[PDB]
Give the backbone structure.
Amino acid sequence: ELFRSEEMTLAQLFLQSEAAYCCVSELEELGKVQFRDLNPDVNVFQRKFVNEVRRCEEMDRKLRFVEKEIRKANIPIMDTGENPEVPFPRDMIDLEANFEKIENELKEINTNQEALKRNFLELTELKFILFVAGVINRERIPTFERMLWRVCRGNVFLRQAEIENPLEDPVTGDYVHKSVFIIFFQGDQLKNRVKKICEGFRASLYPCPETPQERKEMASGVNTRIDDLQMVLNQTEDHRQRVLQAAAKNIRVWFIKVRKMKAIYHTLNLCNIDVTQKCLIAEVWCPVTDLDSIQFALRRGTEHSGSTVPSILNRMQTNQTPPTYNKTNKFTHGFQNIVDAYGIGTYREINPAPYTVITFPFLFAVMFGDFGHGILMTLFAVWMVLRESRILSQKNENEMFSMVFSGRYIILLMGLFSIYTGLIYNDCFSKSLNIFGSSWSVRPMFTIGNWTEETLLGSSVLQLNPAIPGVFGGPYPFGIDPIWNIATNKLTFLNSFKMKMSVILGIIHMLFGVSLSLFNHIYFKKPLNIYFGFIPEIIFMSSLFGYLVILIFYKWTAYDAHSSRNAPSLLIHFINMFLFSYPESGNAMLYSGQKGIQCFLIVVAMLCVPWMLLFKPLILRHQYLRKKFDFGDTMVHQAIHTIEYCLGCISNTASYLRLWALSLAHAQLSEVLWTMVIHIGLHVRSLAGGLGLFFIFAAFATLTVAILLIMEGLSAFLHALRLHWVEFQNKFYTGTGFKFLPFSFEHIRE
Amino acid sequence: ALSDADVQKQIKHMMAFIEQEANEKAEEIDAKAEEEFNIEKGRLVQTQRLKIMEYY
């Protein structure tokens, strides 16, 4: 039982237009149905939902306008209820108009306030004044005076003043100290000149002076008017704010209500309106299993409609390519998306995602097999999940954080497997984990084995620990024996392991990918694709590459150090296998009779090619002419398949050397970051060591993340994913389909 | 969720809807025809009755 896309019915529904409005609204809340456009050559004016959409668009923009003011006003707009019910009566249009009135009132109030603000400031300046003791920042007064001296020789004294805690200049929009030095003239030519200077210079000039008591009384009247203006202003602003918050409550509900209505009308435009009756016919895609749910939703919708039209949705002979629908949840959605990123699977194709969930994180952990980073990686994913409710129910304009958040469940696994693999690799920041089970060798017995005082020469040499001395041996219970982590030849012992492991894992995984193709070919009843396809293809790959895998395990258990000299080299036998190269001497054989086996398997692999190469088009030609089909094109297409398959098997097997290549790189980058950074934090000086280690570690931590946790994690992520797309999927996951895009009320947070 | 018997049943109900609309619409049309009948008849009757009365 394999996961496949859901059945689709390409079904058509006819119902009355009154019932149709309600039904679309209710089926939309169901969110399980995707309607098709029955009038692809008809524009929005032609669809005749344009008046409804236009109104929605105007409502939307006006709402957004007010929303900007609301947001500036810090209104909570929690959007936690009412809105989900999305009722869509025709009376909502008048409600839309009411919205427009509210925001328009607000627009007038603020405009009035700004004029009032100007008057406030303008009167405040006069208040302060009572030529003139105006409002100046003393920007050009040092030069104002000189300009006056330039026009005439200072014929009249200037009036000076300084404002403590000056008022916010209206043009400035902020509060600046104000200082005034203005000259009065009796001459008209010069007064006019001064007027021009004052106009040109940054000075406040428009005072209407009197010397009479009456002017002081006017100034009192000004203060009174100022107070009245400020009172009215304060009331205007208070009303504004109260209205804004109250509207913010209704606006969160409205936003989604309007969006829903718009979506409904737009969906109904993507239909064919019948001409002779006020009834609507539409074709929709829907899940088969969910059809009953759809009919019940339709029943409820039309029951709300006063006409209770039967609204019967009847399946049509589905015969166009249906969309590919894979049901996902909070966990599996992310994995489906990284599959979809490569392409949408063929209808009823085998969905690779259920295997990706484990396969991909596993391959990552192989590339990223570092226990210490596995912890960091796991903890990051846990943090994101624990804050899921706070991060999701928020705005996240930075797509880099959103991206990793959306994959937080994918990362969680990668961390968990990275721990598993790191422990087997026995590397935690280039450190091994000794469980007191390291019994690789017994050094006391080393000295017994003709090694007496080797530590004398040792001062300048290494000396390799011998195999099969009779006193060493025994496997490490779990992972690589810690002893190798401190050897100078780690880089050969463990390097060989990773090379052979990468080959083993790659080939086995490839064979799985091929095995899946059999189920798909059975599902679509294509005997030819298994009698001339699968069978010779799986045999071809097995005979060449599965044979190699067997030999790798054989060598590990067949040969001991007792035969280390002239021990067979698996790579050379593999090449000689393909070439039928069997020298009389120079290479020992792995087992007796191997020559016959090697020859047989290659012959079989070659005999597998005709099957996949040309036997299918030949039988198709037979059946065609027996019944009586582009034979030429079919032969070419099948030939291409064989060529790419065989050459790909060779290249694909090598491709999995990515597992080794990156695992090696990570360990080497980790080792050098340790050795060339944190080692320095240790010292024979006590206090200096403690204090330095603090600062050095912080740098080590910084580089550890910057280089390995991010960058190499990204490389391992991508390359493990690339292996999934290229080598695995291409063995069974073929063809394309359409993305399933049902009509549903998904855009609630947006 | 519906069988062929049920689909055909609903088709019959929808046809019943169409027939019902046809009847209601025709009845409305005939009613208006009768209204126009009586209105024009009155207009004509009073117009010429008055002319006769005037000659008398």
Summary: Chain A touches chain B at residues 14, 16, 277, 279, 291-292, 294-296, 309-310, 312, 314 (CB under 8 Å). Chain A is about 60% helix and 5% strand. The CA atoms of residues 61 and 222 of chain A lie 42 Å apart. Residues 213-269 of chain A form the longest helix (57 residues).
